[PDB]
Design a binder for this molecule. Sequence first.
Ligand SMILES: CCc1cnc(C)n2nc(CCc3nc(N4CCCC4)nn3C)nc12
Ligand SMILES: [Mg+2]
Ligand SMILES: [Zn+2]
Length: 312
Amino acid sequence: LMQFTLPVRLCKEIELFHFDIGPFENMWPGIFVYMVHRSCGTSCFELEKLCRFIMSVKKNYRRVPYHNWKHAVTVAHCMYAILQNNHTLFTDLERKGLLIACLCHDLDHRGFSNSYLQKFDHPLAALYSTSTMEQHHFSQTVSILQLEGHNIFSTLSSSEYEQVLEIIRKAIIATDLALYFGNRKQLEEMYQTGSLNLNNQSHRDRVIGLMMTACDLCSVTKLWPVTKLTANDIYAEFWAEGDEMKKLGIQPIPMMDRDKKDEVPQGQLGFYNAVAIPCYTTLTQILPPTEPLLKACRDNLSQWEKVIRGEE
Ligand SMILES: CCc1cnc(C)n2nc(CCc3nc(N4CCCC4)nn3C)nc12
Ligand SMILES: [Mg+2]
Ligand SMILES: [Zn+2]
C-alpha cells in the first residue's frame, strides 16, 4: 500500500512537541495524513474520502491572521505529539476523533471572539448563547462530514459513529477558553485528592478537554522565534476586533486595544501565569510524558521576562 513519507528533517522533527509545520501550505495536508497514519493506522480512513474531507475543511477556514488553516494543522500536530507519547492511554475512536476534532476546531472562524459576536448581535449569538463560535465550529464539522464522499467515519457502526461525533463535539466545545479555568480546577482537585479515574467517562472528557486547551495554546510551546511571530498574528486579530468594538461605541479590553501595543510583553506574562503555565502543569501531572510542553512554555515565559528587562 501507499504510505505517506516526509523528508528526513520533517520525519524526525514532526515527532517533537515544538515542531513548526513550515510556510509551505501545500505540504500541510500531507503532514496531517502522515499523522493520521502513524497515530491511527493506514486503515483508519479511506484515503480518497480523507483527502476530500481535508480539502473541504481547508476551504472552510478563512483568510484571517491567526484563526486560520495553519492554526488548525498546528493544533492537530500538537495533538499527534500528545497521542504518540501516550500510546496505550487512548481508545481507537479517541485516536480517530481527536485529530479530526483538532483539524476542525476553529472551522469558519471570522477572527472575532464570542464576546464581539454578542455585542454586535450576530445571528450566531442568538442560535448559540454560550460557546458561540465553538458550537458553530462543531456544526460546520457535521456539515462537511455529510457532504457526498466526505464520510470518513463510514466504516463505524451507528453507535461507534455516535461516540466519535460526541468525542468531537466535546473536544471542540472545550476549546472555548471560558470553560478551561473551571475544567482545570476540577482536574487539579481530582488529581490531588486521588479521585481522578480514567475509567470514568466524565473524567476522560475533562482530561481530553485539557488536552484540547493545551493543543489550542501550543504557540507558547514553540521555539522562541515561532512563539514571538505567532504572537504578532494573535494581536493582529485582537486589535482588529478592538477597532470593531470602538465602531460599536465600546472601549475594548486592553488585550484588544492597539493603543496598548507597549504593554504586550506584560500582557503575555499574565497570560503565561494565569493560563498557559497552569494548563501545561496540570497536563504534565495527569500525563507525565507531555512535560516537554511545560518546559517549553516556561522557556518562553522567561523570554517575555527578558523582553520586559530590555535584554531583548
Ligand atoms: C487564544 C488566546 C491566546 C493564545 N495564545 C496566546 C499566546 N495568547 N496571548 C493572548 C493575549 C494575552 C494578553 N495580552 C494582553 N494585553 C497586551 C497589552 C495589554 C494587555 N492581555 N492579555 C491577557 N491571548 C492568547
Ligand atoms: Mg477557537
Ligand atoms: Zn484554536
